[model samples]
Every structure is written in C-alpha cells, then in structure tokens.
Target: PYIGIVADDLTGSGDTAVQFVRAGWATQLSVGGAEQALADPAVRQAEVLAVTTHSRPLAAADAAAVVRGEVERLRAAGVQRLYKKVDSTLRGAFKAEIDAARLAWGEDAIAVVCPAFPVTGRTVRQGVLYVGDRPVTETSAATDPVTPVTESHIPTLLGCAQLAAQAGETPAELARRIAAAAPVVVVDALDDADVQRLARAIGVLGQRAVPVGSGGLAAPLARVWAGGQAAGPVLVVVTSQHSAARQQAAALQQAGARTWAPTLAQLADDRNWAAWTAEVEAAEHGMPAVDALMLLAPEGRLAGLDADSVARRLGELAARLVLAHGAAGVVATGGDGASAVLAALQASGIALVDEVTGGVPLGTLTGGQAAGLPVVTKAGGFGEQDVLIRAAQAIRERRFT
Candidate 1:
C-alpha cells in the first residue's frame, strides 16, 4: 500500500479513507484492531489503509502505546507513508499520539501538525486554532465531556515549535526549512488552498515527515502521494447562450485560458467555416504554452442553424483538438454540448467519479478511443463565475483522472 493512516477513532478512519477514495485511490478502512486489520487480505492489498485505534478516550500513556503498535504493524505491512489522523477539533491525546509516531518512526522523522478543515470553518493562524471566526477555546470544544481542549494555541498544547509560512515561499523551500526546524512543528492553514500547499510540502519532505491532520489535508495528500504525471492542457467547450455561460467563459479568459468563438454570420455560411477551422487549428501552436483552450459557440442568434448543429460542429472540433494535441481533460458546459463531445470522442459513457462542486459532475470517458480521459460537465447556468476556472484547475492537478 502507498500509505497507512492511524486514526484515533472509527469515524476519523472512515473520513480520511473517503478522501483517498474520492481521489481515485483504492482505500480500505479496518474497524477491528491493528492486528485484525493486518491479517485481512483485502486490507493488506489496498492502496490506502486506515486503522482505528479507538484511543480517543484512553489515558495519554495508553493511547500512545496503541498508536505505536499500529504504526509498527503498518510498517511491517510495507506501507510507504504514514499519516496520523487526529480530530479536527483537537480532541483526544493529540500530543501523545503525535509523539508516539515520531518516536517509532526513527531518528529523522518530523511531524507537521495542521488541524484545519476549512469547509467546516476550522482554521489555524499563528499557532492558534479558530472555529468559524472564534478561537477554539471560545467554542464548544473547550467544554467537551471526554477531552476538553484547554488551549487554542497548538504549539503551546503540543509543547513544540511553530513554523509560520512566508508570503511567497514554494513548497520545496518550505520543506527544506521545515526539515531544519523542530521535530514536531505546528503550521497554520486558512483554507483548502493553504492545506494543499502544506500537502505539497509533505510530498517534498517525502518519508522524512510524518503527516498529522484531518480530512482536509488527507484529500490533497492522497493526490500528491499517488504521484501521477502532471496533466496536459485542458480543452473547454461552452455552447450555452445563457448569460452565466458567457460570464463564466470571460472569467476563465481572465484567468489565462484562450477562447475561440464563431460569429453568427460565420456560422450561417459553410465557406466561412473553413477559415474558422484554419484559425482554430492554427491555435495549436500555442497549446503547448497554455493551460487551456476554450471553444465557444456563437453568442448571437443561431442564424438559420439549429442549436444541435452548432453543438455537433463544436464537438467535432473538440475531438480534433483532443486527438491532435492530447488534452489532459475536457470541460463541457450545457447538456447538448457535453453529450455531443462524448459522441464525437466515440465514448460509450462516463464513469462518474466526483464533483468539482455541487451539481457539477466530474468523470472519465469509458469504452472508446479516449477512455479514461478526465471530464467535467456542468449546466449552462449552474455555479459561480469562477466555476470553469476551478474545473480546469482540477484537471490540471491530475487527481480526477
């Protein structure tokens, strides 16, 4: 297996497993103790194995012992990386759990602790945790029955040094500095992007760092750990005349995606299309230099042509670009355009995987020339103006494929 996770509880094990699953890894969660989990054949073969210690309510010394046992079991099972999954709210014998893994991991192992899960409004800044806008000590976590968190400052709670991120430091640079810092380091994360940055740092650190975090860090860590080649350029198709579609396309353009669209008069005449074809094909020279090339249908009236024909023509163009230049993925807005692109690619169906956000389906092509090609499909009027850019970025990350 690529990675093994020692979570403090059953729910922690499941949530972290889902992050790996969503990133297309074959993940298994073993509810039984580490011994039972290591004996299970299916669990042994998984790309990611999450084992629950059930140590959240145990004494600090007892919890540390259980964690060390689990870590040794995972090591014997031949996992390459280890993630210590703790509560997002900072519950349990968190410090002891981290210390246990570091001791068992060896002399050079470092622990990077980040408990931020932005979607749930959990964030850390300057070594202090915040729930929503309030400090964690000011939240309900301060009054928990089993494991009341007395301190909001992570470095203080863990009795370790804290690392503050520099404004423009790359992950590799941050990792180098981290390797030179304390054995257990607490870092701040404000949102998903921050967590992603930290994940890349762990990737740069490789086996030298023991990761400690919630599902927020797990998602990106799975992607970086799996280590797929960087995805090539993306091809975006927009055929909806809805104002939202144009706005989204414009937003994508603002974010460095090139756009090619035909005028109403050009679509009305067949001769004009050859010039359009030449112009569109000519843009291939720049494909290697750009991240995305968006294909937009006419924004004006169809000019005697039906919407179906426009969609079909655009799909053919998309297929041509994909075949010639090799797109990492395809983003199609509007139902007709999306289906037409699939047909043009000679795909039988889409194997649904996940979503870029609510209602936008992300999948891969199936049973055809471009099978396993990643794709994102959305309704014309759905999502915010930045949705297309986000979809393109998801493909560029190469996680969905």
Candidate 2:
C-alpha cells in the first residue's frame, strides 16, 4: 500500500484528504485528534496518508512520538513510502523529525512541505531518504484555502506539481510546467467573475479552463475526470446553489471530470421563522412524535439567537427525544445557527461530526440517532432541493471517487 501522511490541524487535514480523494487518490477520513491518527486502523491500510499539522500546539515530545509511531506503522505495514505534510511555521521541527525518520527508514521517507499559505518555497536540502536534493514536494498552495477547492481542481494542482518536481524544475519553471500541464479552473458564484478573470490570466500563460459549479460539483466531476478522459487540466467550480451544484456535478461526472469538496458549508441561522418555531415548540412540548428539526436562515447568518438558552432548551428535550437507540445524530445547517446547534448538542453530551456542506440526508447518515426525531437545521442559500440525494450519493461513493 502507498500511504501518504497529511499531518496538519484537523480542518486542514480534512480538507487535504478531501482534496486528495478528489484527485483520484482513494482516501479515508480518520477523524479525532492526533492521538487518533497514531492508532487508526484504516490509516495502516491506506496507500497514501496525507498528514496535516496546522496551528495545533503539539508538544515537541508528542510530535516526535507521532512521527516515530508513523514510521513504525509504515514499516510494520510494509508500506512503500510515507509523505509528510509540513508548513513553514513548523519547518525546523518538521525537518528534525524527517531527518530522524530518514536515519531509521533509510531512503523510504519523503517529506513534502506545504507552505502555511499560498507562497511557493524552495527545497534547500536532501538526504538518502529524500526524493531529490531538497523537499520532494513544492506547491504554491495557491488555490483558495478559505473556500473548498472542487475535485476537478485537485488533479490539476497535484499533477502539475508532481510532474514539475519529477523534472527538477525551479519555481518559475514549475509554474510554467504547471501551466503547460493544462490546468482547469473552477469557480463559485461568489468568485465567478474573479475565476473567469483568473482563467483569462492563465490563458496568457497558456493554461486551460474547465469551469463547473461550486465545491459540491467536486465528487461527480472527479468520477468523470479520473476515467482518463480529461485530456488536460480541469477546473470545477463549487457554487452556493446546493441543488444546482448537485445537478451540475452529476452532469460533469457524465462528461468525465474529476471533482472533490474539501470543505462543506453547513449554514446555521434562524431565518425560517415558521420552521424554527415549530421545531423548537415540538421539542419543548416533549413531542415524541416529532421526527427532526430544521433551522433555516438567510444569507448564512446567525443573529439574535441566545446560544445558552437554545442549548438549555434542547438539552432538556433530548432526554425524551430517544435517538432510536443511538442510531441517529443531529444535523445542523444555516450559518452560525448550525454551529450553535452543534455546540449546544455537544454541551448536552452529543458526539457530532461535521459533514462536508450540501444537503446530507440527516436521517440516513445518522441512521436512527435523529431518525424519526426533530433534527434541527436548515440548508444554506445555495442549498439544493435534492440535497438529500447528493448527500446520499456522496456517502455511497465515499470520498468523491
């Protein structure tokens, strides 16, 4: 198995994993803190593990232990190679750890330093375990990290970087190489104009553009692109329209495009007065008949809601909610409202996992936890009518294949 380790903070690691999966790398999301990473069974089975360490304050000893554990695991698993994802901030510690691993693993260790931000950096040194005389991987991290990068975009970036590094190209050379690799650009409605402009700019440098919808378009498009039909770089745009994005995504997949959504937007707010009132009221009334609660807000805004009060109310109701033998869990959406609900639930001793944004069928994903119960939350502005279908498809496909 070829495992790639993406060691970063939780969110970044999740994002990177989603990106890699979108790029045609089979991926499994191993959630939990760093400790979980050290012991995840699936990690041992993966061909590539991308470990991402962000601003997580790991003690030097703990960090080293993680590195050591990773090395030990890889060796025991008979994995081909390990990819270490590091940022500029942790360069010193990252290097030290890699050097130690090299000593133990010989030439089987490879370190890829992803700059904390989008700027490109040079690979200054290399050893026996190193792929080249410097860092084995160098990237601009150029894509917008704030928003999710669709599946189609991941391959172009990954392929571009891989090809350039293989050729021992300089940053400028790599840039040109990536351009020559026929990059496709996807943009969302928010950045539609900007993305169009970006495509034009890249065109001057001789790159290609294959725009789709929003990040939601990633999964479906990626399935198409990975079939070896996409001749050049492909760009998939993830938009806010949940339904439209899903439809477009399906279309892209049929057209043979690669797509992925690293981050899913879970909107939370109290915009749907009627719906919110009904759910809350139902819970308050101890309505065992209630199935779920949906909170809808406009523009993904969370305003004028008392978090403590909300939590207190929901916590009281939970005792009677009966999550069907723990087979169900709460699904939150809208903007801050979703976060608020999640936070409230957590306070009440509910374990919650944030699903990538879009309309994930809460009943199906949660099984019976919130199944047949009032699940609280609402889809965002771009949320689609068939969000449930998309979510079901995403789960079924498992990592935007």
Which candidate has the highest TM-score of all? 1
TM-score of each: 0.81, 0.29
Clash counts for all predictions: 0, 75
lDDT of 2 at 69: 64
TM-score of 2: 0.29
Candidate 2, residue 91: CA error in Å? 6.9
Identify the leading candidate in terms of lDDT: 1
Candidate 1 C-alpha lDDT tens digits along 45-80: 587788899999999999999999888888877887
Candidate 1 Cα outliers beyond 4 Å, as residue runs: 58-61, 106-108, 118-121, 131-151, 168-182, 191-193, 203-207, 220-231, 258-291, 301-310, 357-359, 394-401
lDDT tens string, model 2, 182-230?
3221111112232223223222332122221122222232332233221
Worst ten in a row by lDDT for model 2? 122-131
- Residue 236 lDDT (model 1): 97
Q: lDDT (CA) for every model shown?
A: 0.85, 0.35
